[PDB]
Symmetry: C8
Subunit: 165 residues, 8 copies
C-alpha cells in the first residue's frame, strides 16, 4: 500500500483580521468520479486511463484540493482571510471544478479545470490547463508535480483576485 | 478493465457576468439507464444492444456530458458565462436529455437527444440526431467520435443561442 | 443476455417556442410490477404470463414509455412544446397508465392502458386497447411491433389533443 | 414459476370531467398481509389456508384490484370519470378494503370486503360477500372466477353510485 | 406450515349514511411483542408461554383484530358507520390494547385487554377478561374460540356504545 | 427457549373521564440496556450480573412494565382513568424509571427505581427500593415475585396520588 | 462473560415537590469512544490503554453515569428535584463530560472530567481529577472503586450547588 | 492491538461566566481522512505515509483534539470559560483545522494546521506549524510528543486570545 497526500502549506503568523474585510470562502472542489475516488490515475492513451491499485490518496482528492487551495490562497493573498468555511454575508465566493489530475503516457502530468468567483453580483469564470514534467518516473514525483502545478494555478487565481480591488 | 472519459476542452481567459444577461446554467444531462450504467453500449440490431463489461466509463456518463457541454459552451460563447451550477436570477436554464450515445454494428456511431432552453421566459425546444463513423477497430476510436459529435451538438446549441436578440 | 430499448424519435429542427403557448407536460407512465420490471413478458394463457430470462429492457419500461411518448407527441404536434419536465403554470398535464405490453400465445402483441388529460380544469380520460402481429416469431419483432403500436396510440392522443383548441 | 394477473377491461371513447361532479378517485385497495403477499391463497379448512409457492401474482394483488376497479368503474359509469389518482376538489373518494380473495377446498371461490364512499360530504359505507364456482381443476380457472367476482362487485358499486341524485 | 386468519364478517347491505352522524373510528389494536408477532402462543404455566413454530397468523394479529373489530361493530351497531380509517372531525375515537390472546395448559383459551373511547371530550376506559373452552385440543379450535370470544367482547363494546346516545 | 411475561391484572366496569381531573398518562417506563435486553438478569456479586440466554422476556420488559403499571393504576384508582396514551390537556403525567428488576444470588429479588409525577403544575419526585424472596428454585418463581413487587410499587404510586387534594 | 453495572442509589421517601422550585436537569454524560463503548479499560502505560474482552458494562457507560449522577444528586441535595428529563423553563442545567474512568498499571483507579452548570444565565465550569486504590486486584474492585469516586465527585458537585442559593 | 489517547489535562477550581465576555466555544477540530481514520500515521517520504494497522487511536483523533484543546484553554485562560458546547449569544467561536499530526522517518514529529476565531464580530485567522523530536524508539513516545505539541499550540491560541482588549 502507498498513500499520498498533497503537502498543505501555511502563511507564517500574519494573523489577518476582518477589519479590512477581504473575505473569501472556498466551496468544495468538485471532481468527477474517475479522480474523486481514492485511486491515482495515469493517462495511457487519448481517452484511455489507468487507475492505480496500491497508489491511493491519503484523504479524498476533493478535500485535499480544497484545503491546499485555502492554504495557497491564504499564503498568496497577504491581508486576506480565506477559509473553507462560511465567513459572513459580505464574503466573496469561489467554486472550483477539476477535470484532470493525472500523468500521461509521455511522462507528463496534467492539471486542468474551471473556477468561478462571485464578488457582490459580479461573476467571473475561467478555465485552466497546465502541464508539468516528471524528473523521475514514479508516482511520488507524479504527486509532487501535481502539487506544484496546483500551487501554480493557485498563484494564477491569486493574481486574478488581486487584479480587481 | 479499461476506462474511458470524454476529453473536456478548455479556453483561455474568459469573460465576466456583471451584465447578468450573459448567464447560462446547464442542468445535469439526463440519460436512460442503458446509458446511465457505467458500461459502453454497442447497438447490434434494430432494438438489440450489447453493454461491454470490461470497457466502462471512467466516471458516470451523464456527469461527463454535463461537464463537456459546459466546457464547449464556455468556449463558443466567449461573451457568456456557462456553468453547471446556478448563477443568478435572470440566469438562463438549459435542460438536455440524451437518448442515444453509442455505436452501431455497421461501424458507425450515433448521438441523439433533445434540449430545452429558457431565455427570459421564452422556452425553446429542439431535438437532434447526429451520426459519425469510426475508422479504426477499437472502443477508443468510438469514444473519440462520440466526443466529437457531442462537441458538434454543443456548437449547434451555441448557434441557436446566438440567434436570439 | 439480450437487452431491448424502444427507438426514440425526433421532430427535425422545428425549434418550437412558447410564444403561442401550447405547453404539454408528461408525467411518469405508471406501469404495474409485471411490466415495470426489467423482464419482457409473453402471455401464454388467459391469465398466465411468462417472464423472459435473458430478454430484458435496456432501461426500465416506464421511463422508455415516457420518453418515447414525449418524442412522438413532439413529432405529431407541430407547434407544441411537449416535455417530460414541468414547463409552467399554464401547461396542460397528461397522465398515462399502461396495463398490457406483451405478446400472446397466438403470436399477437397487445398494448393497452388509460390516459387522462387536464386542460385548465377540463379533465378528459380515455382507455385504449390495440393489437399488432409479428411477421417473425422473435422477441426482436415483438419489441418492434410494441413500438409501432405505441406510435399508433401516440397518434391517437395527438389527434384527440388537436381536436380541442 | 407461474404468474397470474387479473385482466383489466377497457371501454371505447370515454367522457370528460368539465362538469366536476362526474369525478371519482379510487384510493389504493387495501388487503391484509395474507392477500398482500405475492402468493395465491387456498382456504383448506375453517381458519386454515395454504399459500401457493410457485403460483404467484404477476404484480401485487392490491395494485391489480385498484386498477381493475378503476377500469370497471370507468366502463359502467360512462358519464363519470373514475381514476386511481386525485382529480379535483369536488371529486369523490372511494376507499375499498378486501378481506378475502381466494378459493376454498370445496372447489369454490370467495371474495369479501367493505367499501366507503364520500359523495359531497355524505359518507356511505357498505360491506359485501360473493361466492363463485370454478369448474375445471386449475389455478387459472380460480383467477378467472376471482376476476369475474371482482367485476361483479365493481358493478354493485356502480349501481350504488347511480342511486344518488 | 399452518396459517390462521380470524374470520371477518359483514353486515349485509345496510348502506349506512352519515346523515344521522354516528361515526366511529378504530385505531390500531396495540398488542405486545409476544402476541404481535406471527407466532401463535399457548400458555404452559403461570408466566411461562410457548410460541408455536408452524402455527402462525395469516396476517399480523393487530391488523386482524382491528379489521374484525371494525366488522363486528358495523354488524352490532345498526345505523352506525364504523371504519378503521378517519371519518371526520365529529367522529368518536376508540383505542384498544390486547394483553392476552392464547390458550392455557388446562385447554382454556383466554382473551383480555383494555379499551378507551373518546366521545366529544368524554373519555371512558374499561378492561376486560374473557375465557372459552376448546371442544377439541387443536390450534384450529383455539383460533376459532379466540374469534368467538373476540365477537363476545365486540358485543360488550357495542352495548356500552349504545348505552350512551 | 423459555419466555416469561408479567401477568397484566384487570378490573371490572371502570369509570369515565368527563371530569378531566381524573386523568393520568403513564409514559413508557425506561430501563437500562441490561434490563432493556430481552434476557433475564441474575445478580451474582456486588456489581456482577448474569443474563440468561435461554430464559427471555416474552415481549420487551419496558413495555411490559408500562402496561402492568397502567393496569394496576386503573385498578387501585377506580375514580381515575390511567392510560398508556395521551388523554387530554389537564391530564397528569407519570414518568417512571426502573434501575433494577432482577434476582440475587442469595435467592432474593430486587426492584428499584424512581418516578416523577406532574399534578396540575406541581412536580413530585420519589425513589423506591423493594426486596422479595423467591421460595422455590426456578426462574418462574422469580418472575412471579418480580410481578408482585411491581404491583406493590404501583400501589405505592396510587397511595401517593390519593394523598393530594 | 462478566458484565458490570454502577450501583444506583436512592434518597428514601422524601417526595420533594417543585413548590420551592430548586429544579435540576442532567444532560447526557458525554464520554469519548474509548470509554463510551462496552469495554472496560485498564491503563497499562502513559498513553497506552488495554480494552477488556469479557469484562464489559451491563448498560452503556454514559447512561450509567447519567443515572447514577441523578441518583447521587437527588440523595445529596435534600429539597431539590434532580432528573435526567426536562423539568421546566425555570430549571438549571448541568453538562458533564468524563475523560477517564479506568484503572492504572500501579493498581490505582482514576476518574476525571469536566462539568458545566447554567443557572439563569450564570455559567460555572470546573474540571476534576480523582483517584482511588483497589484493595484486591480485580475488575470487581475496580468498578466498585469507580463508583465510590463517582459518588465523591457527585458530593463535590452537590456542595458547589448548595454554595450558591 | 494497541490503543493510544492524548492525556487530557485539568485544572483546579475554575471561574464562572456571568460576565458573558469570558466565553469561548471550541467547535469540533476537523482533520482529513488520513488523520480521521483510527490509525496512527508515519510519514516515510515527502508525500508517502504509512498507517499503522495495530497501533490505533483509543477514540477518534478529532474528538481527542477537541477535548484536549478545551482542557488546555480552560487551564491557560483562568478568567475565561472554554467549552466544547455552545455557551451563549456573545460567546466566541474557535474553528481549528489540523492538516498534519504524525511523525516522520527522521525520528521527528510534525503538527500543522490553521485556526479561526470570532471575537465580537472580528474574525482572526492564523496558521501554525510545529516540530518535535521523539527520543526513544516507540509509538508511545510519538504520541507523547504529539500531545506536547498540541498543548504548545493551545498555549499559542491562548496567547493570541489574551492579546485582545
Amino acid at each position: 500500500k502507498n498513500y499520498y497526500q498533497l503537502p498543505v502549506v501555511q502563511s507564517g503568523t500574519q494573523s489577518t483580521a476582518s477589519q479590512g474585510n477581504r473575505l473569501l470562502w472556498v466551496e468544495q472542489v468538485t471532481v468527477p468520479d474517475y479522480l474523486a475516488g481514492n485511486g491515482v490515475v495515469y493517462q495511457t492513451s487519448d481517452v484511455k486511463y489507468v487507475i492505480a491499485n496500491n497508489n491511493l490518496w491519503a484523504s479524498p482528492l476533493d478535500q485535499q484540493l480544497r484545503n491546499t487551495l485555502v492554504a495557497n490562497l491564504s499564503t498568496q493573498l497577504p491581508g486576506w482571510v480565506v477559509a473553507s468555511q462560511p465567513l459572513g454575508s459580505a464574503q466573496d465566493t469561489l467554486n472550483v471544478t477539476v477535470t484532470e489530475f493525472n500523468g500521461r503516457y509521455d511522462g507528463k502530468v496534467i492539471v486542468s479545470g474551471e473556477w468561478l468567483l462571485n464578488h457582490q453580483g459580479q461573476l467571473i469564470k475561467r478555465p485552466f490547463r497546465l502541464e508539468g514534467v516528471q524528473t523521475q518516473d514514479g508516482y511520488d514525483e507524479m504527486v509532487k508535480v501535481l502539487a506544484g502545478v496546483w500551487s501554480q494555478e493557485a498563484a494564477s487565481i491569486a493574481q486574478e483576485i488581486k487584479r480587481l480591488p
